[PDB]
Design a protein around this ligand. Structure first.
Ligand SMILES: Nc1ncnc2c1ncn2[C@@H]1O[C@H](COP(=O)(O)OP(=O)(O)OP(=O)(O)O)[C@@H](O)[C@H]1O
Ligand SMILES: Nc1ncnc2c1ncn2[C@@H]1O[C@H](COP(=O)(O)OP(=O)(O)OP(=O)(O)O)[C@@H](O)[C@H]1O
Ligand SMILES: Nc1ncnc2c1ncn2[C@@H]1O[C@H](COP(=O)(O)OP(=O)(O)OP(=O)(O)O)[C@@H](O)[C@H]1O
Ligand SMILES: O=c1ccn([C@H]2O[C@@H](COP(=O)(O)OP(=O)(O)OP(=O)(O)O)[C@@H](O)[C@H]2O)c(=O)[nH]1
Ligand SMILES: O=c1ccn([C@H]2O[C@@H](COP(=O)(O)OP(=O)(O)OP(=O)(O)O)[C@@H](O)[C@H]2O)c(=O)[nH]1
Ligand SMILES: O=c1ccn([C@H]2O[C@@H](COP(=O)(O)OP(=O)(O)OP(=O)(O)O)[C@@H](O)[C@H]2O)c(=O)[nH]1
Ligand SMILES: [Mg+2]
Ligand SMILES: [Mg+2]
Ligand SMILES: [Mg+2]
Ligand SMILES: [Mg+2]
Ligand SMILES: [Mg+2]
Ligand SMILES: [Mg+2]
Lengths: 559, 559, 559
């Protein structure tokens, strides 16, 4: 087992998550089996309790774990499945040793942060890195650890102490440290004192960096490389840079151009790892596929515009799996994507009195779009604006996908306007008044990977053809509210077909509307099962439908 | 409310606990109401799970809290009652904020060590210092906080960060810092660089010391004072020393000789605290009583020897409340005390084969003693040796006190040798063989302050006369095993009278033997209710009985 | 005497020098007498030995001290005269205590960085701040100390230790700390962890900041202020920002808008300083003059273009007094300035073979300009290019000023082309060949403030009219080479009049050419005597001449 810590810097926004995911995928090009662990200094047990306004969305695993967003970067670059154990936190590990001290496994000893908590962290990392995470039976060859927060924040102290010990409690040449660090530019001169201070803060904790990975708005000067490589122990080829490029898929090839594998191939002795003839082929094949999708982003120009309608769209981190799911679906179509970020509340007619500027801009953006997405996220702000987007998309025949809350919004819209029930509404917020036209109801969560069964007549639907006309689908759920199953037959008779349901019925999971080119919704989040070469099927439907060629996509999928 | 932090140094053994207790009692000489809080960086919720081989005994509060030993130093110097809340720990406060984050009181925010855990520590200190701790109704004027561990140990980090904030979240002139620090002597020269480094480690965390309290084997030189007072912000009178004197009761008067009150009277503005005419009298009266008991230790010479028989007596911290209870009882008698530390196992005849030196020395020490104590502490090592000490004390008519296990050992001894049941024994360790002559049985703990009722005939006993012939007694329990109540009438008929029991009966709490000058035992720990001017009654009995004058002590108590 | 330390941050490029100069001038608006001290962690005794390619130009004082560039910012904002003592360095103070230890003033004691070097720094600051620096007789009321380098660089250690002591060796309310710090913006979010780390690094040395002065590309958010004011001891009004505005003259009014005086007026108790009725008037008058010159930069639009021709013009810090002298002269004319930065070598015909792009651009820039400046700076690169600019300016009748080397270049040009001596040249670089047509000769430096006497016939010259037709001028020299006084009568007969000379003659200091609107040169640096309200006279000539209205400027000066 090899370990690669990706760590620290001078700021919390530095973009470690891209570099960790990219470093792991580059190791996967050698054919190595790879896994990864995110460490969070926060005291929350999970990202589930904490609101999307901080650290972006929670990400859902097959376990039903509501983990930190960074686990999604690993799953979509590395192709692996992660467990709720792969997101370590301060909350998890203090809860673990405190529950263990009350149970008494420490034999009446005094329990202390060193050695007992730092040995508990090292036991967690040793257990969790040996969980098999590919579909194959094998234990991973390499583990990427991403150390969240910044080095020398008091929040991090047990993890920087544990990782010092770990560099010896596992062999050297089985452990290596990448430090990620800020190189700000002032008056056009590339200033280095922030990264020199961060390299000292690592040495103060006994962590010694094997590569320094600069984050900068420029190519590093050869003087900027030398002034760091002379201050730190790293050689000139071990001062990595990652530029402020928009395409995060280019980062693996920007690291490969900087010869970063050729250092880790020595520094971790990756030639001593045994590999089969299948492994080297499936490794090199994966690199050629990534050269092709990045070539397609360099030379595809013909924009498809998708409008994304939701709360707090200024927090673009709040929708990162949607963004990445749309980008995978646009690459599969060989088309460039624009996302138009529509703050759903500004669509509402009250905005035309309160701030007439925001009203006209938000309705410009929505009218402009070749297809529409309503992305999910609980909370009562802007839902009539999201209902207005679903209405516009139904009436103007514009491709629509509704994910989680977006499906319920389309059901409420179709009830208010096509069934003509003018006060039909979500149970989430009006039930203090005990309303009879319930569109949502409660059914304390439904979470993680679940089976959807396609209902027997559904063979016609564009969405069931996108799932290869298979009878069942596996996707990740997260909801407490679902469509009222008393009203379902009214919608299924008026043409809004609930194409798929849970095994028990009375719990709707996919709809497609008869008489529209692509108007679809899902109760699950299709984003989380997206992979770079195999996009999320409902999103491959939406981004093909917006472009045209949805028939040719379905004809392809029938091979 | 005023706060006085006592803190840190270069080593964990430095003796903060004496200085905190002494500083608080000196503030009590002004008539101020005083309280105190111990902070422990360990992850244990309580000292109850952890074995006496580390940090000495657990101390029992009236709550039944098995707290850190340092709470006992506060109760016996300050005269206060502490709650299980007055011992803060890493385990307590991480358990508190983690349970609070799962309950969700933090409104979906990300929870972090700063500000959320440091604000939870500051809320704990603010709540707990306002608990009334004297017998009177009033809230305390001053709180002493003792910061356990050492400054810049990673274990301490949330508490040194919290206390920086606290210096502002409560006013300056309502908070002050005492730093306690090591001044080692090499070649007879008093070296200062360890304390200069500890003063820098405080400044690095933003904590600024108002007094530096040196711990040294000498009087500080005036150069040793100046070389510290020139390096640090403290004036010459704010460099305190506490010498390696044996009598810890002299420390309050050694601080008073160094004019330490006259600094805090300015630095905390203690003249602005309102005080009544009763308060100043009961304050100054308390100082004169302490001048008298310390004068008596300077001029009493006529030694009483008590042998203390138990496990691990090399760990003299394991019996600190016994030691202090014996010292209070010897001072009340105006007699000097020697304790003879007898490792109970060495009394056993197997020792005479294994190491004949340890056998003869341990039996020398036991034969030498004017009275005998068997102190408690669970675990099967040496119990036949403790039975042999109880036998010797019964047969030779030598004063005996058995506390907790020491009472059960005397019951087992009296059963084996006076009732003549040769295999009668503790249920604690032989019950894998299901023995019928059970002396102990289980009755998951009995803990904290409980009532003992004296059984109706008991008026004759020296122990009930020592409790003023009152019908009931309040003392602190800690046990899972008690005397088999089926066998009690056999002992009460053979003369081993169970003088006191729980309200329900079938649970024995005090015995006295008919036909011995003072042979007594208690199921409770009488040590924990000892106070400097009012010693523990069973121990005032033992140390009077060893000296003679037990009648005159009882005649006094009848006033 | 009051002290205001301006300090530190995360980077060496942060712009402390503007903030120190601006803070001092704002204190001068109260009428206080002000002075300032620059501390440099470098080991050079002076900036004289070190080449202009690092830390910009050396600045010349009236003493002849070749000081750090930052002393010029103080002289031109504060209006004061500085001595070579006002630039403290590591080289100066270690040379001082080492020479003092060899002389033995330390009475055979062991000499150490603390207390002896830190007390030597504190003695330097106490001596030097009491030097009178205005033209009046008074000792300064306030001293601004600028701490060069960054805090926690090992280079700085004696100065951060000395300044901790100084906060007590002078009273609190007579000392205050401004910390200047970087607030980088990433994804449009204003990240604060670099400044939180810099505030900890101050506390680690015992320096406590009274204001935090952010340097950022934006207005701080009110959340960005609160997240710093909650972490540090500073109040919300003590988190200062200085924006990336181009006009450094706006910074005093941006600090005044942030109410920064109203904090220091309390925190330094500046109302306790006695002030006369003249002082408050000359103080408030100075503020109104600064409101006017800044209003003129807001509403003047009619550009004058000056081409500056020299070595290494990419290092714009290399010519900072030229830049500021041109800006003062353009403000006095009520006209906006563009400087066109012409790398002098690119003008040379060899460039048209080597890189034809750089040739055409440099000759575009020179042809475009309303006036030309040749700025000084020793070294043989580009001098024929500077000769070509002097030729172009003479022949096309375009206003020309030559400063130091720029005068000698114009003398060489006039000799090569108007006297027709085709190989006449500088002695600086050809004298290995012992050439007879010497234009320069050596006359080991001439340095500091010196008298120029105007030669008797010179009453006609635009340059002597710009100096008010006074018979003598006081300006700062710096040169080893001067015009060959054997050839001077040839130039004075051909019309290139050496209008001014040293008292001894044979040493030429000003020329003006008969028969050109303004073609002038100086051996001294006129830049260094520029002040915001009273620009350098040769530069007020150049920037008026380029604009037209040179007659009206001279008519004004005759009042
Ligand atoms: N080298 C990079 N190139 C492009 N974008 C980057 C880069 N580094 C960081 N980012 C971007 O900055 C944001 C944060 O990056 P990332 O998640 O990898 O940082 P992080 O250190 O893991 O932050 P966090 O601790 O909050 O998870 C993301 O939007 C990411 O795409
Ligand atoms: N000034 C002193 N004079 C005499 N004995 C002292 C002194 N300081 C410490 N000691 C002794 O050293 C031991 C530890 O002292 P104390 O309990 O006060 O230290 P502490 O800092 O509180 O240690 P801990 O953190 O383990 O509780 C005790 O036996 C105590 O009596
Ligand atoms: N607030 C600011 N607004 C505009 N420019 C600034 C500001 N702060 C710094 N600069 C610019 O950055 C450069 C360096 O600034 P300054 O000389 O004041 O920094 P410094 O800390 O004194 O650097 P050094 O230590 O090298 O002297 C100069 O060009 C200056 O004009
Ligand atoms: O204003 C001043 C005065 C003095 N000094 C002095 O500090 C020294 C250290 O040099 P810097 O502090 O400029 O650091 P650096 O260039 O090595 O690092 P970067 O942050 O640019 O990567 C020398 O340059 C010396 O003149 C300053 O840096 N700035
Ligand atoms: O062996 C050596 C050589 C050099 N030095 C040098 O270090 C210096 C600092 O002096 P010290 O290190 O002796 O420190 P100090 O006496 O101030 O502090 P204490 O620890 O005794 O309280 C000077 O004494 C200088 O000679 C040593 O201290 N020891
Ligand atoms: O990637 C991760 C994982 C965990 N953490 C964790 O570290 C914590 C500290 O939060 P930050 O490190 O983001 O710091 P901050 O926002 O207070 O400071 P700025 O630098 O933005 O001014 C919490 O946010 C917790 O989730 C991260 O910061 N990043
Ligand atoms: Mg943040
Ligand atoms: Mg991340
Ligand atoms: Mg220990
Ligand atoms: Mg203690
Ligand atoms: Mg530099
Ligand atoms: Mg400067």
């Amino acid at each position: 087992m090899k370990y690669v810590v990706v760590s620290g810097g001078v700021i919390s926004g530095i973009g470690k998550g891209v570099l960790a995911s990219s470093t792991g995928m580059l190791l996967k090009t050698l054919g190595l089996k790879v896994t990864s662990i995110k460490i969070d200094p926060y005291m929350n047990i999970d990202a589930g309790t904490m609101s999307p306004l901080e650290h972006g969305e929670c990400f859902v695993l097959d376990d039903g774990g509501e983990t930190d967003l960074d686990l999604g970067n690993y799953e979509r670059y590395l192709g692996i499945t992660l467990s709720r154990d792969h997101n370590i936190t301060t909350g998890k590990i203090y809860s673990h040793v405190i529950s263990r001290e009350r149970r008494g496994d420490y034999l009446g000893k005094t329990v202390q942060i060193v050695p007992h908590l730092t040995n508990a962290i090292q036991d967690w990392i040793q257990r969790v890195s040996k969980i098999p995470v590919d579909d194959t039976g094998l234990e991973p060859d390499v583990c990427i650890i991403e150390l969240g927060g910044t080095v020398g924040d008091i929040e991090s102290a047990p993890f920087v102490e544990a990782l010092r010990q770990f560099q010896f409690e596992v062999g050297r040449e089985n452990f290596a440290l990448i430090h990620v660090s800020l190189v700000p530019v002032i008056h056009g001169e590339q200033k280095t004192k922030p990264t020199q201070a961060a390299i000292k803060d690592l040495r103060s904790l006994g962590l010694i960096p094997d590569m320094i990975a600069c984050r900068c708005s420029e190519e590093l000067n050869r003087s900027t490389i030398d002034k760091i490589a002379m201050f730190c122990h790293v050689g000139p080829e071990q001062v990595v840079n990652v530029h402020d490029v928009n395409s995060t898929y280019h980062v693996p090839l920007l690291l490969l151009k900087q010869h970063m594998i050729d250092y880790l191939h020595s520094r971790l002795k990756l030639g001593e790892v045994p590999l089969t003839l299948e492994d080297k082929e499936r490794g090199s094949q994966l690199l050629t596929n990534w050269e092709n999708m990045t070539k397609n982003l360099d030379d595809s120009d013909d924009v498809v515009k998708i409008a994304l309608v939701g709360k707090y769209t200024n927090l673009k981190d709040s929708y990162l799996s949607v963004t990445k799911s749309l980008e995978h679906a646009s690459m599969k179509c060989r088309r460039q994507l624009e996302i138009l970020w529509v703050e759903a509340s500004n669509l509402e007619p009250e905005t035309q009195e309160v701030d007439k500027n925001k009203f006209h801009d938000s309705w410009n953006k929505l009218s402009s779009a070749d297809g529409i997405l309503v992305p999910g996220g609980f909370g009562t702000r802007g839902i009539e604006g999201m209902i207005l987007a679903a209405k516009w998309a139904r009436e103007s025949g514009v491709p629509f996908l509704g994910v989680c809350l977006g499906l319920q919004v389309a059901a409420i819209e179709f009830a208010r306007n096509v069934i003509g029930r003018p006060n039909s509404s979500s149970t989430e917020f009006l039930d203090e008044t005990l309303l009879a036209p319930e569109d949502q109801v409660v059914i304390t969560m439904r979470l993680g990977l679940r089976p959807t069964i396609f209902q027997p007549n559904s063979e016609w639907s564009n969405i069931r053809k996108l799932y290869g006309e298979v009878n069942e689908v596996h996707e990740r759920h997260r909801h407490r509210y679902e469509i009222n199953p008393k009203i379902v037959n009214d919608m299924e008779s008026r043409g809004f077909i609930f194409v798929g349901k849970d095994e028990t019925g009375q719990r709707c999971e996919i709809f497609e509307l008869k008489g529209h080119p692509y108007y679809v919704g899902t109760q699950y989040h299709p984003e989380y099962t997206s992979k770079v070469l195999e996009p999320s099927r409902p999103f491959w439907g939406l981004v093909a439908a917006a472009s045209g060629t949805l028939g040719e996509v379905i004809k392809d999928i029938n091979l």
